[PDB]
Design a binder for this molecule. Structure first.
Ligand SMILES: CCCCCCSC[C@H](NC(=O)CC[C@H]([NH3+])C(=O)O)C(=O)NCC(=O)O
Length: 221
Protein backbone atom coordinates (compact mmCIF):
# COMPACT_ATOMS: atom_id res chain seq x y z
CA UNK A 1 0.00 0.00 0.00
CA UNK A 2 1.51 3.25 1.22
CA UNK A 3 4.28 3.31 3.84
CA UNK A 4 4.99 6.67 5.36
CA UNK A 5 7.92 7.48 7.58
CA UNK A 6 8.63 10.94 9.01
CA UNK A 7 12.25 11.85 9.84
CA UNK A 8 12.21 14.61 12.44
CA UNK A 9 13.45 15.99 15.74
CA UNK A 10 10.57 16.72 18.04
CA UNK A 11 11.38 20.32 18.90
CA UNK A 12 11.41 21.47 15.32
CA UNK A 13 8.34 23.53 14.34
CA UNK A 14 8.77 22.34 10.80
CA UNK A 15 8.34 18.78 11.89
CA UNK A 16 5.36 19.75 13.99
CA UNK A 17 3.65 21.04 10.88
CA UNK A 18 4.00 17.76 9.10
CA UNK A 19 2.76 15.79 12.14
CA UNK A 20 -0.30 18.06 12.24
CA UNK A 21 -0.98 17.41 8.62
CA UNK A 22 -0.71 13.64 8.91
CA UNK A 23 -2.89 13.63 11.98
CA UNK A 24 -5.52 15.81 10.23
CA UNK A 25 -5.93 13.15 7.63
CA UNK A 26 -5.66 10.26 10.02
CA UNK A 27 -2.65 8.84 8.14
CA UNK A 28 -0.59 6.27 9.81
CA UNK A 29 3.15 6.54 9.64
CA UNK A 30 6.36 5.63 11.42
CA UNK A 31 7.75 8.62 13.43
CA UNK A 32 11.50 8.47 13.41
CA UNK A 33 13.62 10.54 15.65
CA UNK A 34 16.84 12.01 14.22
CA UNK A 35 19.71 13.32 16.24
CA UNK A 36 21.05 16.37 14.55
CA UNK A 37 24.56 15.83 15.91
CA UNK A 38 24.57 12.26 14.59
CA UNK A 39 22.32 12.09 11.56
CA UNK A 40 21.30 8.77 10.25
CA UNK A 41 22.37 7.51 6.90
CA UNK A 42 18.70 7.41 5.94
CA UNK A 43 18.45 11.16 6.71
CA UNK A 44 21.67 12.06 5.00
CA UNK A 45 20.69 10.09 1.90
CA UNK A 46 17.08 11.33 1.87
CA UNK A 47 17.95 15.03 2.15
CA UNK A 48 21.60 15.31 1.01
CA UNK A 49 21.14 18.84 -0.07
CA UNK A 50 20.26 20.41 3.27
CA UNK A 51 20.50 17.50 5.68
CA UNK A 52 17.58 18.85 7.44
CA UNK A 53 14.31 17.57 8.85
CA UNK A 54 11.51 17.15 8.38
CA UNK A 55 11.67 14.62 5.66
CA UNK A 56 8.67 12.59 4.73
CA UNK A 57 9.35 9.26 3.11
CA UNK A 58 6.63 7.74 1.11
CA UNK A 59 7.20 4.21 -0.12
CA UNK A 60 10.86 4.86 0.22
CA UNK A 61 10.77 8.24 -1.62
CA UNK A 62 11.74 11.45 0.23
CA UNK A 63 9.94 14.75 0.28
CA UNK A 64 11.52 17.68 2.03
CA UNK A 65 10.47 21.09 3.27
CA UNK A 66 7.55 21.26 5.66
CA UNK A 67 5.18 23.24 3.36
CA UNK A 68 6.03 21.21 0.34
CA UNK A 69 5.43 17.99 2.24
CA UNK A 70 2.03 19.39 3.34
CA UNK A 71 0.95 19.94 -0.26
CA UNK A 72 2.40 16.59 -1.30
CA UNK A 73 0.14 14.93 1.29
CA UNK A 74 -2.79 17.06 0.17
CA UNK A 75 -2.45 15.93 -3.38
CA UNK A 76 -1.56 12.28 -2.90
CA UNK A 77 -4.03 11.54 -0.18
CA UNK A 78 -6.88 13.64 -1.54
CA UNK A 79 -9.38 10.93 -1.09
CA UNK A 80 -8.45 10.58 2.58
CA UNK A 81 -9.76 13.08 5.15
CA UNK A 82 -9.95 16.83 4.58
CA UNK A 83 -7.69 18.92 2.34
CA UNK A 84 -5.51 21.74 3.52
CA UNK A 85 -5.99 23.46 0.22
CA UNK A 86 -9.09 24.78 -1.33
CA UNK A 87 -10.29 23.62 -4.66
CA UNK A 88 -10.38 27.05 -6.25
CA UNK A 89 -7.14 28.32 -7.82
CA UNK A 90 -7.65 31.90 -6.46
CA UNK A 91 -8.15 30.63 -2.96
CA UNK A 92 -5.16 28.42 -3.26
CA UNK A 93 -2.99 31.41 -4.25
CA UNK A 94 -4.21 33.40 -1.39
CA UNK A 95 -3.41 30.57 1.04
CA UNK A 96 0.08 30.21 -0.38
CA UNK A 97 0.46 33.93 0.02
CA UNK A 98 -0.18 33.81 3.69
CA UNK A 99 1.99 30.75 4.23
CA UNK A 100 4.79 32.77 2.72
CA UNK A 101 3.96 35.67 4.92
CA UNK A 102 4.18 33.44 7.93
CA UNK A 103 7.57 32.06 6.96
CA UNK A 104 9.08 35.33 5.94
CA UNK A 105 7.60 38.05 8.15
CA UNK A 106 6.85 36.04 11.26
CA UNK A 107 9.06 32.97 11.60
CA UNK A 108 12.24 34.51 10.32
CA UNK A 109 12.18 37.61 12.55
CA UNK A 110 11.13 35.47 15.42
CA UNK A 111 14.19 33.32 14.90
CA UNK A 112 16.32 36.44 14.89
CA UNK A 113 14.70 37.60 18.09
CA UNK A 114 15.75 34.30 19.60
CA UNK A 115 19.13 33.52 18.14
CA UNK A 116 20.16 36.94 17.19
CA UNK A 117 23.83 37.87 17.81
CA UNK A 118 23.73 41.58 18.72
CA UNK A 119 21.05 42.93 21.07
CA UNK A 120 19.80 45.31 18.37
CA UNK A 121 19.25 42.28 16.18
CA UNK A 122 17.27 40.51 18.90
CA UNK A 123 15.20 43.70 19.18
CA UNK A 124 14.52 44.18 15.50
CA UNK A 125 13.34 40.58 15.12
CA UNK A 126 11.03 41.08 17.98
CA UNK A 127 9.68 44.25 16.52
CA UNK A 128 9.05 42.67 13.15
CA UNK A 129 7.44 39.60 14.63
CA UNK A 130 4.99 41.71 16.45
CA UNK A 131 4.12 43.79 13.39
CA UNK A 132 3.58 40.58 11.47
CA UNK A 133 1.17 39.23 14.00
CA UNK A 134 -0.96 42.38 13.65
CA UNK A 135 -1.14 41.80 9.94
CA UNK A 136 -2.03 38.11 10.37
CA UNK A 137 -4.95 39.10 12.54
CA UNK A 138 -6.45 41.04 9.60
CA UNK A 139 -5.97 37.98 7.43
CA UNK A 140 -7.83 35.80 9.87
CA UNK A 141 -10.61 38.38 10.04
CA UNK A 142 -11.12 38.07 6.35
CA UNK A 143 -10.64 34.24 6.03
CA UNK A 144 -12.65 32.95 8.98
CA UNK A 145 -16.08 33.48 7.40
CA UNK A 146 -17.54 32.34 10.65
CA UNK A 147 -15.65 29.00 10.91
CA UNK A 148 -12.76 30.46 12.85
CA UNK A 149 -9.79 29.18 10.88
CA UNK A 150 -7.62 30.65 8.23
CA UNK A 151 -9.19 27.91 6.21
CA UNK A 152 -12.79 29.00 6.95
CA UNK A 153 -14.77 26.18 8.52
CA UNK A 154 -11.86 23.68 8.45
CA UNK A 155 -8.17 23.70 9.16
CA UNK A 156 -6.24 24.93 6.18
CA UNK A 157 -2.73 25.29 4.99
CA UNK A 158 -2.25 28.63 6.71
CA UNK A 159 -3.56 27.24 9.97
CA UNK A 160 -1.05 24.50 9.88
CA UNK A 161 1.76 26.68 8.82
CA UNK A 162 1.25 28.92 11.78
CA UNK A 163 0.01 26.16 14.09
CA UNK A 164 3.31 24.39 13.86
CA UNK A 165 5.09 27.10 15.77
CA UNK A 166 2.65 27.40 18.57
CA UNK A 167 4.61 25.38 21.10
CA UNK A 168 7.59 27.61 20.37
CA UNK A 169 5.46 30.70 20.82
CA UNK A 170 4.44 29.64 24.28
CA UNK A 171 8.08 28.87 25.05
CA UNK A 172 8.99 32.33 23.81
CA UNK A 173 6.46 33.95 26.10
CA UNK A 174 8.03 32.10 29.04
CA UNK A 175 11.53 33.18 28.16
CA UNK A 176 10.84 36.77 27.26
CA UNK A 177 7.88 37.80 29.38
CA UNK A 178 6.13 38.92 26.16
CA UNK A 179 2.80 37.62 24.81
CA UNK A 180 3.04 37.15 21.06
CA UNK A 181 -0.69 36.82 20.37
CA UNK A 182 -1.71 39.32 23.05
CA UNK A 183 -5.52 39.41 23.03
CA UNK A 184 -5.57 43.15 23.72
CA UNK A 185 -3.77 43.75 20.45
CA UNK A 186 -4.73 40.60 18.52
CA UNK A 187 -7.88 39.12 19.90
CA UNK A 188 -8.74 37.12 16.78
CA UNK A 189 -5.34 35.40 16.85
CA UNK A 190 -5.41 34.81 20.59
CA UNK A 191 -8.77 33.02 20.18
CA UNK A 192 -7.49 31.13 17.08
CA UNK A 193 -4.64 29.79 19.21
CA UNK A 194 -7.14 28.39 21.70
CA UNK A 195 -9.28 26.84 18.98
CA UNK A 196 -6.28 25.29 17.23
CA UNK A 197 -4.60 23.71 20.22
CA UNK A 198 -7.84 22.09 21.15
CA UNK A 199 -8.01 20.10 17.91
CA UNK A 200 -7.25 16.43 18.31
CA UNK A 201 -4.62 16.73 15.63
CA UNK A 202 -2.96 19.45 17.63
CA UNK A 203 -3.01 17.46 20.79
CA UNK A 204 -1.31 14.62 19.10
CA UNK A 205 1.24 16.67 17.27
CA UNK A 206 2.28 19.82 19.12
CA UNK A 207 5.21 19.24 21.44
CA UNK A 208 5.05 19.54 25.12
CA UNK A 209 5.78 23.03 26.18
CA UNK A 210 7.57 22.15 29.43
CA UNK A 211 10.06 19.93 27.70
CA UNK A 212 10.30 22.37 24.86
CA UNK A 213 11.15 25.10 27.34
CA UNK A 214 13.91 23.09 29.01
CA UNK A 215 15.31 22.29 25.63
CA UNK A 216 15.22 25.99 24.72
CA UNK A 217 16.79 27.24 27.90
CA UNK A 218 19.73 24.89 27.38
CA UNK A 219 20.27 26.18 23.88
CA UNK A 220 20.04 29.80 24.88
CA UNK A 221 22.55 29.28 27.72
C1 LIG B 1 15.90 20.99 16.80
C2 LIG B 1 16.06 22.46 17.12
C3 LIG B 1 14.95 23.28 16.44
C4 LIG B 1 15.58 24.49 15.76
C5 LIG B 1 14.89 25.07 14.52
C6 LIG B 1 15.55 24.47 13.31
S1 LIG B 1 14.50 23.12 12.83
C7 LIG B 1 15.83 21.98 12.43
C8 LIG B 1 16.31 22.30 11.04
N1 LIG B 1 15.23 22.24 10.08
C9 LIG B 1 14.51 23.38 9.62
O1 LIG B 1 15.56 24.23 9.40
C10 LIG B 1 13.93 23.06 8.25
C11 LIG B 1 13.43 24.31 7.53
C12 LIG B 1 12.66 23.91 6.27
N2 LIG B 1 12.47 25.20 5.63
C13 LIG B 1 11.27 23.31 6.40
O2 LIG B 1 10.33 24.10 6.35
O3 LIG B 1 11.03 22.09 6.45
C14 LIG B 1 17.30 21.23 10.77
O4 LIG B 1 16.96 20.06 10.46
N3 LIG B 1 18.55 21.60 10.93
C15 LIG B 1 19.62 20.60 10.75
C16 LIG B 1 20.80 20.82 11.69
O5 LIG B 1 20.72 21.70 12.60
O6 LIG B 1 21.84 20.15 11.55
Amino acid sequence: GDDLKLLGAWPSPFVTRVKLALALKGLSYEDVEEDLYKKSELLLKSNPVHKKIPVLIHNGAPVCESMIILQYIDEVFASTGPSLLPADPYERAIARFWVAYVDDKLVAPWRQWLRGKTEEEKSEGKKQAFAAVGVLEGALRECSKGGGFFGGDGVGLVDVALGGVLSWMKVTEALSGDKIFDAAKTPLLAAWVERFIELDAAKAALPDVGRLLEFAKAREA
